[PDB]
Structures are given as structure tokens and as C-alpha cells.
A paper describes a structure:
Central to the replication cycle of influenza viruses is the viral RNA-dependent RNA polymerase which transcribes and replicates the viral RNA genome. The influenza virus RNA-dependent RNA polymerase is a heterotrimeric multifunctional machine composed of polymerase basic 1 (PB1), polymerase basic 2 (PB2) and polymerase acidic (PA) subunits, that catalyzes both primer-independent replication (vRNA to complementary RNA (cRNA) and cRNA to vRNA synthesis) and primer-dependent transcription (vRNA to mRNA synthesis) in the nucleus of infected cells. PB1 houses the polymerase active site, whereas PB2 and PA contain, respectively, cap-binding and endonuclease domains required for transcription initiation by cap-snatching. High-resolution structures of the complete viral polymerase from a number of human, avian and bat influenza A viruses, as well as influenza B, C, and D viruses have been determined. These structures have revealed that the polymerase is a highly flexible macromolecule that can assume a variety of distinct conformations, enabling the polymerase to perform both transcription and replication that require different initiation and termination mechanisms.
Using cryo-EM we determined the structure of 17 polymerase-nanobody complexes at resolutions between 4.5 and 6.7 Å; this is sufficient resolution to accurately position each nanobody bound to the polymerase heterotrimer. On the PA linker (site 2), that links the N-terminal PA endonuclease domain and the PA C-terminal domain and wraps around PB1, we observe three nanobodies; Nb8202 and Nb8210 bind identically at residues 220–240 and Nb8204 binds at residues 250–265. In addition to the core of the polymerase which was resolved in all structures, the PA endonuclease was resolved in the majority of structures (excluding Nb8189, Nb8190, Nb8192, Nb8196, Nb8202), while the C-terminal domains of PB2 remained unresolved in all structures.
Author numbering:
A (entry chain B): 1 to 185, 207 to 756
B (entry chain C): 1 to 249
C (entry chain A): 1 to 716
D (entry chain F): 1 to 24, 33 to 50, 59 to 99, 112 to 122
The structure:
Amino acid sequence: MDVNPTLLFLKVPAQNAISTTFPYTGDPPYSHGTGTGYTMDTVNRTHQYSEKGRWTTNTETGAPQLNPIDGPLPEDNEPSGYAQTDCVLEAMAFLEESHPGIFENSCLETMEVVQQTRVDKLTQGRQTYDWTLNRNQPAATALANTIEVFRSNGLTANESGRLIDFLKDVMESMDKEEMEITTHFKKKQRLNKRSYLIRALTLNTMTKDAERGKLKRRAIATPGMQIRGFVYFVETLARSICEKLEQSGLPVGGNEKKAKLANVVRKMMTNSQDTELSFTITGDNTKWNENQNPRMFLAMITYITRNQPEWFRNVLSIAPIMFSNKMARLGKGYMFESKSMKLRTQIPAEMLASIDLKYFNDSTRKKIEKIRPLLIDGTASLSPGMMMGMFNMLSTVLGVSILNLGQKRYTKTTYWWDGLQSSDDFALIVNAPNHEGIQAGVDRFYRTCKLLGINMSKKKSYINRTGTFEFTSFFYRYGFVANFSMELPSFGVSGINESADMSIGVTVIKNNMINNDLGPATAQMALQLFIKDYRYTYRCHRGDTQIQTRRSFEIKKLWEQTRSKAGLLVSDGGPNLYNIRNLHIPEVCLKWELMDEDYQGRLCNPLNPFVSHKEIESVNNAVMMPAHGPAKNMEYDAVATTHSWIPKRNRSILNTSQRGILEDEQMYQKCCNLFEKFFPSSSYRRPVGISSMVEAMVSRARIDARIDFESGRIKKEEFAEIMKICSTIEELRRQ
Amino acid sequence: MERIKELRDLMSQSRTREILTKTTVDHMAIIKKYTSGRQEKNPALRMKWMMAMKYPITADKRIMEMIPERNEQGQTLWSKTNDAGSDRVMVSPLAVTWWNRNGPTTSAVHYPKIYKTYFEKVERLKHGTFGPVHFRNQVKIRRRVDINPGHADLSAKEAQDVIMEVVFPNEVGARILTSESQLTITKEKKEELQDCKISPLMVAYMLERELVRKTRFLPVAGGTSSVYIEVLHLTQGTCWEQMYTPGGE
Amino acid sequence: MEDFVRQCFNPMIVELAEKAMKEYGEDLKIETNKFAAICTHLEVCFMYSDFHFINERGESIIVESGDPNALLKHRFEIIEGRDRTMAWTVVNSICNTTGAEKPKFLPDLYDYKENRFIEIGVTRREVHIYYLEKANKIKSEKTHIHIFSFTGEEMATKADYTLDEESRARIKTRLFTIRQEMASRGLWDSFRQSERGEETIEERFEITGTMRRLADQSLPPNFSSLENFRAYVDGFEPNGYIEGKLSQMSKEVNARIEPFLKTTPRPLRLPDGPPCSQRSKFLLMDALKLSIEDPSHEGEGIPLYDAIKCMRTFFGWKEPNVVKPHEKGINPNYLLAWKQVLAELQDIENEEKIPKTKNMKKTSQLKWALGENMAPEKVDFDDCKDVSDLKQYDSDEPELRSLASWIQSEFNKACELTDSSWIELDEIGEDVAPIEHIASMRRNYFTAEVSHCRATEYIMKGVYINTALLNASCAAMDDFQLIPMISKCRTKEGRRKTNLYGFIIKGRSHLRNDTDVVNFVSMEFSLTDPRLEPHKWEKYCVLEIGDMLLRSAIGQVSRPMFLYVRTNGTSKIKMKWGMEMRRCLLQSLQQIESMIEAESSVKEKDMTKEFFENKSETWPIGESPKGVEEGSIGKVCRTLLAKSVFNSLYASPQLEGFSAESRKLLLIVQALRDNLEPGTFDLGGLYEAIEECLINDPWVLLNASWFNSFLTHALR
Amino acid sequence: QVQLQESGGGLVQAGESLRLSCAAGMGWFRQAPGKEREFVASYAMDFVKGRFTISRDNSKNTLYLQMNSLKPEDTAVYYCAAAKYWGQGTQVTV
RNA sequence: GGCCUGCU
RNA sequence: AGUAGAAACAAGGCC
């Protein structure tokens, strides 16, 4: 007899055992080298899906741009980006009519937010493409570098501390004859108008790793800092709009998505009488981002912001204007090998414009030949369409408009449709009195989608009777069925620290028990395995064992020293008291009454040199990138113990010409620590104002010395010493 | 005394003097987050990879004057080589366990008073009474429920001023809290935590967690109470219901 | 008017007033009289505060110039002259230290004698109105208020004047100096009434310059300016434009539904080529175990001593010789490496105490076997351009290979029971709730079912091997290291036992990226002759190292005993994911527990015990030439565990792609079997998407064969 | 200010085609002998939809009406109009 | 041969 | 050789 697990589906329905079809117990695919090939392929594919448009050359950037809007209507089922302006404007108008007051309200709240938003909001972001160094750097670092360059060039309106003023300075920089940047190898280099325009309109391309569910790798993009404020405002407007649309599912979580899917299916099927047939289409959109033209987003926003202050319209329109002229950096480059001479070489992507094509294979040779005409200063113009879901929410708005355009008031026919859209994925429930009606409805829905630059993937889509469908790895079969294979990768040690890892593991087990219908015995097994892996990872074994490690000696002496050994934490080699009933309690508090007072005091000592807290945002928040989803943050319950240390940093900056960044880091951190000691609320509430550091610090020294004498340790001798030391630092700052 | 003294020492050197002079208060946050350290994409892989090194964690410089450089057999506990972009020094994990067996001891009696939420959870569970398990299909319907069982009927911003006035009374600014509920909360949490020396930031964070109301959407069947939702994993399942009554009731 | 503040007042005050001007964001060129008025207010604040000191008594000491001493206390300490944030900082600090009441508006000074605030304001109008005006602005105030006015008069409540009168003569002399100096200037046409409390501003975000031209190039094809396009949008109204283009659009743009029937789906085609080879990092079906029967636990013990003790338990060693060559390497190197390992093992046996971890010598043998100094040296392009052989890295579709029957048998025997327990679980909090007791009983049942399973043994082998390899790579980056493959089990009798499959030599492991490869050489004992399925051992070199005698009724077999030696490699990501193989247990048993719960939701009672003991119900878990064979729930547990283990062992992008694109077709087939009239828009496209994932991986090809068999058995 | 001249009318067979052009938003309108004006295209009327296509060249300053699959009921003077400004019309007889 | 780094 | 698979590793750089 030959064993075959798949035959199990002959008795257990597919959805009731779908977890077996998710090989999420092995290493996910990773990219190894350059992503330049993928970037070039994506650029060429985006440009050839809109080949029948019209070509122009921008007078500012001098780059060739392709406009397919209002182009010839498609005559085949292949992907097409020839969106029609009038059709999309009409779709938005119908969306407004079905939801009166949506645009005006959303614009009102967006106007409030834009005029009260601060610059620091841009620091709350992941890697961004700093143009000062032409590389990806943390959002805060890139923002600081750009602000420094602007201030050195004379653009100091951002000193007002307002994001709108920062954007005003950004736009004013576009009209400057010559800017100056700094490079280390420090050298001051001058950038002319066109070079700075291209550096501000460019995107950095990388390869996406840890992407499960496809054989081929893809490319993703990261924009600069000049354009992120406009993107933030536009996405704020789009989120405020989608929050008023029940057909959208992008700005919500997973459980809300499931609830809305259940509600829509029940509404569609229940209202349908015996005569009407119902069919569900589990649709995926092929080349979703490559076929969405930024000009059409400009049209949608300018229709949304009608009868609004002109400044609001301008600030919300700046973003799509820059995306329509966006450029993409090709990537890291290409690495060549010569086996005859036994050597390797790494050529940067910027040489692709001039480098001969003898080194490249046929596929890459043709890709380079096709993309060369669009190469301007080492970057390729990508006007026709978006690169990687930067306007997720606006795309969801367009999809929701398409979904609502079939409310049976615009169809003008017996058939009708509804459903749920989340960018690149949708479920469409279509009802009609007969199979011919369903066919006509789906055909018209597809045709209308093709008029908006949205394509339906026929290969990854199928239609059945309502009651069974899929949506973003959520399988609905007369009710959503748990999978538990999507969350399997999150059952190990997170990698934050000991206490954080313990709390995160127990909380993940608890949550997957609540949401993903994890069984009790399975949860106990998960707890046991997690504890085993945790002890084997942090070298913290039970203590009563003879497992020799680098940490087994101190742990054993602590074990033999303690009297009530049941109170020792698993991190210190103690027994595990966790169970299904204790999954919502931190380890420290669960073992508090069992700890010896000496060990308890040594553990939770504020003066410990290991605990370090930076800001209110990073107290008990851990960023865990979930499998098959975007990066997410979790609140984990933990007590600040000596085990809450933060791990070592990379330390490879020491071998790079960018070595002075570490000295600047140290000096900035010293100044920030001094300010915090002067202003204790610096971390919890970020200080605001327009004065400089030393003014506030010296003046508060004055006052605090005064009052702490009026009652406290200070003495006249010390108070006068502080006053004249303040005068000394004053005259020092003078010179 | 000291604080202004390292201030003067910083202003002595030209670079830090320029940083202090030209940098305005508003930019405080930016430069504080200014770092070359990228946020890790795969934390688990490197935590499993770094812990195999010697000196994998980081600690303040003060550790060099509280913990000896080596233990009884000579296993090193800390190194004097500083981190990449900080004055902290890289140290071995043993320096943690050492601190828990011969490090300085204090009076942790006030931690229960600080971490009110967690200890209240423990007390509620310790006095709970279980019941028979009933096996029948559960119609889990998804609903918006409040998870925090100690929220004082305050929002984030609404309680943020209360938290500042409780911890940072001088940086409150214009705000003087009007609602009398906030008055009593301030009085109680002021007299209760009058000399607690854990940290201002952690105290503020835990006060925010305790007082601020927070809500999330979850699949529930029955219950719906704040105390009954924290144990939702233990009382409700796919085909079984476990009757439970927390210690509070 | 600004010429006056150019002339008279000192710098300090003028820049203080200029920063106060910047504070609230209004411009000085439009209205300057406010600047002069508030700078005079600030000047009176200074001149009233300075020159006034106190000592330990009350009765302020007044000195025209502060002498060098600790006695420089200031009688009145200023509030204004600071930012709003700091003004409120001082207010709150004074309130919290003085125990006084917090005012709602900005004071100007604080004093000790009377322990309270002073709000100085000198207005153009006479005092006896401005005083009570600001008084009714401030609610129930105990802070004393004092104001002057140009005529020279003073006033205050309580008839209180807080310091010397010569200072006030100073104030009013300053005051009339101001007055009869404007007399020379001539400003009272507006000086009395120049500020009325104007607060208004309009936010301006104007598109101009280059950024405007960009806006003119981001419009539809037939538009010339953003102004015109916005006007058109504002004037646009729906007039049935979607219908017109829908009618005009070609009818070939359709989404016709192709019915999906029993005869529609065709079997997935498998690639053809040379048979598929073995990819695992260790032997799974052909492993052999040398044991000692020690009482130590899994992690307890020292590796090298245990390995040597286990190997000494076997007698019959012969001089090794080549049996099956690598066919691409230098087998004599493998032979010499094996003999070197034996020699150095003896060398450890001789000395005092077995080292916890041993380093081996870097001979040419393992230099070749571990691929040392073979990475091409990195150079610059400008120095290597004329080399004809210089080209890209080989980037093409992997070699095509057809499925072989060995993977099927390997999976078959990976789901079989064993004579040992390969899982020793940790401790949990004592169960207190009845649901916890039910969970514990279920868990005990599953552990009894799966512990005696080859899948669990493979899990432990992989976890231990990858953990040791990762730790050695991170610790001994430079020097080759010896690691014996160790796994500890427990017999039926209950006696604990150790097992030594072989050895692993780890090489240079300077791993920077998650994809960087660490090469090692693995040696494993076995009894399976490699002359029967050679195509499965394409990358192995197999020697003959001894003879084994296992008790059998046919005299005694005296079988040969071979050594499978190969060069393999891994990476940080692969090591990390292989050291988390225990979650296969989770996956499998979660699936089984979901089955049990779903069935128990029907009958209102827990159904675990009868499922595991009666074994009445069975699921299709394989096909025999007679037909489909069904097994008890325990066999399903073992089968799913083996499937998860093989997923973790043979993981690859092909597996992910095939899994997704075959789950799609499985859902379609399930819809067909449920009588839900399934339909497809392009089924050929889906088939081509599935078939492109099957290239050379044995596991994915076996999964595809299983899928074809399931289709054949289904659709009936 | 806007003068308009139509071209491209004449005698045609039933089921034939005809491309009207008007040299100068814009409309095509028709007048049969026994009636007032009828809307053709600007959007198209029910009686002419799918048969007839309206298209402009703004660089040539011309509006075109491409008539196909003509019926005896298309027989009219076809007038071009600009929006107040009306051509003299071109005779089409089917 | 000596020393530096391992997400920069 | 080996790992791996649309491009890489099989140490890097600095003296």
C-alpha cells in the first residue's frame, strides 16, 4: 500500500482540511542577488501594456513618458492600461450619488489633519530612499539629512514644524538653479535643476524576499522623502473615504474582513428569491499595479476635492503629479563571473545605459535593449503606471466604485452584482434570473473593469454557486473555516528579547486559539514546543539538568541558591507553570508570589544596566512581519525585568566610508539624553517649540536650581554656582 | 549640579556645541531617531544566530563597575568594546543571570502597585471557579468588544493629560483637567506612586494602558463582558464551552 | 516708528521682543506699535525685577550692582521673556513648590516675601480702568496686580506696593522719558489705540514654477493645463458615457464561463528526464543506529564521548574501500577523510578528558571536500573587460528530472511505527480546569500515536543537526569542526538509549547574508546497498566500512555495512527553518484535532477516546493496486506528520508555487463534487501555471502524482 | 464667428456607408423633409446607435460622422452645429 | 605572519 | 565539486 495524503480530500471537504495544502513548515523562497532584472522586466511590461498610448518628452526632466489615457479601446482580453477619463469620472460621480456627502466630509477631515499635521509624523516609517546618499536609509535619518540640506541651501520654512511648510519648502526646492549635497569617501557637490528633479522623482527598487505562494520573484519600490508627505495626505483622504464604504476591506483587519464577507454573501443570497440564481466569482487581478495610471488618480482626487479650498486641492494633487513623472532606479546592478580567469565582478546598474551587451544573456540583452530608450541618468521613466501598491487605498476606492456601479440602479437589467474588493483581490456575488443573465452580468462587469485600467486574471479566477469561495487566504464554505497554517511561522521565538519572546509566544498561542480555532491539546503542544525551543535558543535550561552550555553554570548556582525554585523564570532556568488558563498572564506576575524576595529584588531592579527604554511608542510594541501579509505591530504584555535587554547592533558600519554617521549618532544621543534629564517628558510627549536646545536647558537650570533650593538639597553656594555656570555657558554660546 | 556640568562639558567641544545651538526643540524627535541601524526584517533568525556569539547583548557602561569582568571559572561577563552607535558596551548573557544571583537587591513591593493590570489579571484568575465542559456547536459571531477591563472611561488623549499631571506635573502646560473623575484619578495615582522609582516612562505607559479604553473586533459567543473577554481563549472553543466565573464576581 | 526701537532700547530687549514677535507668527512690518508697547512692558519688567536682591531675611537688599558673592538672589524672578512652553513650565513649577494656586493666564514675576505672582502691565489708558479690566479677565486671583500709566499714576488693590518707592519714581521717570520722547517723534495719532486684537490667516499652497509645468504634463492626452482640466472636471456630470463605450467596445472582450464537468479536468503532466535524486541533508530511510543504552537525556551529555562510546560498541571494522563513486568528485578524498575522522576520534579517546567540541586539521582532502578557496576573487570591472569568457552568472530554468519510485517508498516508511519513543516533551502547569484535563488526555493520545514514528525521529535528527551546525558556524567560523550525529530515544522496556548515525564536518562559515552557503561533508552508516537504486545517490560517495551481525532466525545475516559520504551545504535561513521542524507536529495534530472537534460538534460529546481505541471510522490515506485503502485516525496522524516533515525537508519555491496553483484546482474540483456548477474563465492558463512549478524536486513531483491519482479517484 | 461647412453627403445604397465631415463641443443633427430637427450625435440617439460614430480632429478643426449600415430612414439633410452656430447642412439620401 | 567586520 | 535556482554563495575590505 502506498500512502497518499491528498486522497484524504475524498472524505474531508477541501476547505475543512485546507491547512494540509500550505507548506509553511519549510524555508520560504529568497532572492540571492540583484533585482535589476526584475525591475527592468516590470518597467518594460508596464510600458508595453500601454504601447498604443501617445509618447511625449517632459520639458523639465527630459524623460520620455507614455500617456495611454483615452487611448484606443481594447480589442482583446490581454491586460490593458487604456483607462478612459470620462468613464472613471462617471464612476466616481455614481459613487458620490450612492453615498452623498462622502467626498465633502472626507475632504473636511483631511483638511483638518493636513493643516494640523507635524513634520515628525514622517519619522514613523520604514526604509525610505534618501537622495542625499542615493540609498535606502531609515525614515528618520533620511528626513534629517534632507532637512539639513534644505537648511544649508536656504529653505528654512520647515523650521515652523509643520508638514505643510515642509512640503512648501520641498516644492520651492524644485525651482532652484543649484543645490548642494555632501558626500564622504567630506566633499560638497553641486546638483543642477534637472539632476535634483530626477533625484526627487526617483524610486529605489529591491527584490521582495520571504514571499510564499509563487515560483518567481518580484520587485518592489521605495520612494524618497520629498514625495512621502503628499502620499501621506492622499492616503489619509483615501482611508477616510474607504472607512465610509462597506464594500471596501483594505483599511480593516482580518476578522472585520470575514464579517463583511459573510454579511455581503448573506445579503446577496437571502434577498435573491427562488427564481434568481446566484454565483460567486473568486477573482484576482493580473498586473494590478502596472495598469493603474497616476493621471487617473489625479482625476479621481480632483473630482473628490471639487468645491474645496484651492490650496487643499493643490496639496492633494501634487502627489499624483509627481507619480506621473516618477522615475525608478534600476537596482543594485549585475554580477559577472569568468571561470577561465576565475574571477567575479559587480557592475552597477547605472552602467546599463552605455555598457556593451556582450556580457548579457539573450533575455537580459533584449530587456536592456527595450528599456534603454527610457534611461535618463541611470534611472528609467515609469510614467504609465504604479510600481508597487503605493496608492493602495485609492485603488481600493476605484474597485469599490466598480463594485457599486452594479447596484441594479445603473445596470438597468435583471442581473446585478455586489461583493468586496481589497486591492488585487475580490469576491463578486452576481445574481440573475438565469444562467444567461449571470453570463451577461459577469461579461459587463469585466468590460467595465477593462474601461478603468483594471484587469481580471482569468487563470487565477473561477466562478461557482454562492456558498463556497475564497478571499485573501480565507476560505468560506457556508461559514469561514480556520486555517492555522498561515500563522504557523509565528509560533517560534520572535527574536526581540527573552521576556518579550516569552510574552509574544504565549500571546500568539492565545490569539490563534481565539481567532484561528486552535485546539486545546494543540495549544498545549505548541506551548511545550515553544518552551523547548525558547530554552534551547537562550541557553536557559531547567537548571536541574546536566546540559552543559555557555550559561549552565550561573543558572545552576542560581538554582541551588534559591529556596523556592518554583518562582524562577524560564529565562533563569526555572519550571514552566504556563497552561491554557495562564496564556494571558505575563511570566513575571504568574511567578511573583513564588519568587524569593532576594531573587525578586535582583530581577526587577530599576538600576539594572540592561533595561533601556527610548520612547512611548517602543515600550511594548514588537514589529513582526506576518507571513503572507504586510509588516504589522503587536502589543505584548511584559514586565520590565533584567531580561528586557536589547540585542547587539550590526556593527558593520565601521568598515564603510559612512563611518561618521556613528559619531553623529553618539553625539545626538548624548544631547538627547541631556535634554531628557532636563525635560523628563521628552519621550512620552515629544517637545514642541521654536527655541534652541541650550536656551531651554540653561533657563530650566536657572529655575530648577532656584526652586529646589526654596525646598530641597541645593544650597546658596550651589545655587549661585549654578547661576554663574549658566552665565558661563551663555557666554560660551556667544562665542 | 551634575546635569548642567555635563551640559557645559558638551558645549566645550565644538561639534556638540553646534548641535545644541542650531538644533531647535521641534527637531528633538528627528535627531533622537536619527540612526544608521535598520529595523530587522527577520528577528528570529538573528536572535538564534547572535545568541551563539560571545557578548551578544548590550548594557549601559555602568555595568563595568557593578559586575566583575569574569565569573568564578573565568567566563567573561562583559566587554569594554562599545556598541556601534552608542556608548553602551556589549556584554554576555551570563551578566544577566549573575545580576539575578549576586547583583544588588532592592524592595520590589511597589511593582504590584505599578503593574496594576497584570496583577489584577492574576488575582482575578486565582479566585476563579471552573465548571463542566459542555460539547455543542458554538455559533461564533464577530463583534466589537473592549479588551481592557480596567479602562476608566477615558480616551488616549483624554487620559494623556491626566498621565502627564500624575507623572510630569510641570510639563502639563495650559491644560488643567476639568472633569472631576480625572481629579480623583490624579489624586489617587499621585499619592499611590509618590516615591516609586521604576521609571517615569514605564509608569506613564502603564497608566495609559490601565486608564485608556481600547477596543478590538473578535469572534465571540456569549460573554461580551470585559472580564469574560480576557479569558475568551479558555471559555469558548470550536465545539466546547467551559463555564467560568472570574474572581471579581 | 521702528527707528525708536533702533535708537533707544538695548539689544537684549529688542531681540527678546523679536523672538516674542516670531512666537505667535505675525509679521512686524504690518503693525509695529505692538512691538514697541510690549517691549516697553518687558523693559519695565526687567527694570522692576533687577537691582532687587534678597538675603536669608526678608527686607530685600537693594544694590545698584551685584557684588561678587553667593548673595546674588533676585527679589523678583521674571516670567515673561520666555516661550509659552517655558512660561507655563515656570508657572507649574512655582505652583508645585510654593503650594500656591495656578493662574490661568501669564504672570510676569514671582516674589518670596509675599510668595506670589505679579502681572505688570503699563497701558496707554489710565490705570483705574485697565486694572479692573485685567482683573475681570483673571478669575478669582490672589496674585497681586500692579499697573502704571503714562500720566505718572500708580495703583493697586490692598493699597499694596511691594518694594521701594524710589524704584517707582524710576519707573515713572522712564515712563515720561518715553512719553516726551515720542513728543519729539509724534506717534499719538495711533499710539493710544493701535492694536485691536486681530487674529486671522489664510493658508496658501500655490503650485508655481517647475512644479506647475509638471502638472501640465500629467493630464489626459487632449488637455493643455491643470486649470482647464480642473474646470472640465468641475463642469463634468454623468451623461451615460460608460454605456456608449461599452456598446462601442469590441464584443471579443468577454469573460465567457466555460462549464467545469467531470470530463473536463485532465491529469497534470509530469516532466520527463533523468530520474530524480536525493536532496535531504541526511539519510532518512537508510539510516543505521549505534547505541549505548545510557541513562542520559536528549541534551544531557557530551557529544564526542557519546559518539566514541557508541562506535566502540560495534565490532567488525574493515579497511574502507570504494563501492559506489561520486561520479563527479574525487572519491579517494572521501576515503582519506573517513580514515582521518577515525584517527582523530582515537586521538581524542587517548587524551585526558574528551573535549566538548573538536576542531579538525585543514588537509587538502577536506579543503576540496568543503570547497575552500574556490570562490572567484572579486575584482573591478575596469580591470577585467577584455576577457572573452567574462559573462553573467548562469541563470536558466533548472534541469528537468522525472519522478522515481524511491520517494514514494521513503514516504511510505516515514509513516511507519517504530520500537522507540522519539519525543520527550517538556513540562506544563498542572491542569486545573476540566477542559485542561480533556486537552491533556488528547495530547497524551496523540503523543502515544506519533512518538513511535519515523517522522518524529527525522524531526529530532534535523533539529539536532541544524542546531549543532548553526552553533558551530557562529562560534568556529574559520576552522573545520567535527559534530557526531546524535539522537536519544527510549526503548519499550523504558531504558534510555543514544544513537549515532554518523558525523558531520562543518567548514568555513563566514555567513553574512541569509542566503550565503556553509558547506559541510556528511558521513552516515547504513546497510542499504547502493547498487540497487543508483540514480537516487547521484551526489553521494558510498564506501564499504564493515560487517554487521543482527540476530535473525536464518543463522545470522552478517550483512555488509556501508558508509554514505557526501558534500552538502546549507544557509542561515535553512538552518533556522530546519531547527524549527517541531511545528510539523503542530500542523499535523492541529489538523487531526480540528477533525475531532468538527465531528464532536455533531454528537454532543467528546469523541477522542472512541476514535483512538475503537478505530471504527477510517479515512482514505492511500491507494493499493486493489483500490483505495483507509486507515484509522492514528495512521492519518502519522501520514500528515510525515507530509509536514517532508515539506520542511524538501522545501523549495517549486513546492510553494505548486501548492498554491494546485490548491486552486483542488477548490474547483471540490466545488464540482459539491454540485455547485463551477466554472472557469481560462482553465488552460491555470494548468500551465501548475505545470511550470514541476521541474526537478522529488517532493513536488510526488505531490503532483498524488494530485493526479486523487483526480482519477475523484470525478466519479 | 463660427462658420461651418458640411461635406460627404450624397446618394447611397441601403446597408452602405458614408463619412460626413464638418469643417469649422459639437453636434450632428438631421432634418428629414417632413419634420423639424432630430439629434444624431454629440453620445448618439437610439435610432442611430452602433451604426454611426462621431469623431473630431481639433488640429484640423473638423468633426466627422461615420455612418455605416445605412437605412432609407437616415434620408435627411445632416447639419453640423457648434455650442448657436449651425451649418447649412449636407443632403444624405439612402 | 600581525590586527578589523559579520543585516550597512 | 557542492548548495541553489531566472542570481548568487563557495568570506569581505583595509594595509
